[PDB]
Amino acid sequence: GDLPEERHMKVDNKNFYFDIGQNNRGVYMRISEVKNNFRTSITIPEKCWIRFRDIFNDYCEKMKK
Template sequence: MRENENTRGRFLRVSQTISRGGPRSQVAIPAQGMIEFRDALTDLLEDFGTDDGGFRGELPEGRHIRVDNKIFYFDIGQNNRGVFMRVSE
């Protein structure tokens, strides 16, 4: 994550941490949406996380937030490496 600023204002750039030979996926979250973004992540961790970083229960439904003219989607998935959250716009 990196905070940036351009002519349209301040924003937080969130990048994929692992890229397997392809381009790195990124989303830019406007400063006005940073608190809602944090709250959405916190809610998911409080509702479905465990103290050891694991997962409990069924996978939650996806969620979304609207910031200005953007909609950010939070989708939970699972594969052979564990549980993950996909953030897209």
């Protein structure tokens, strides 16, 4: 089917973007960190989105609530 749609987050003075793409090796998630005039990103292949999500729950559960 079509890919999930673009998403955005704002924190402090920077913006985060999430977009989905696909090539011959497959589907991936690009997470960009964009500031007024700086830009860097990471690229996560689909086959490890779950592994990623789990690491995050682990960090979120272990927060000083």
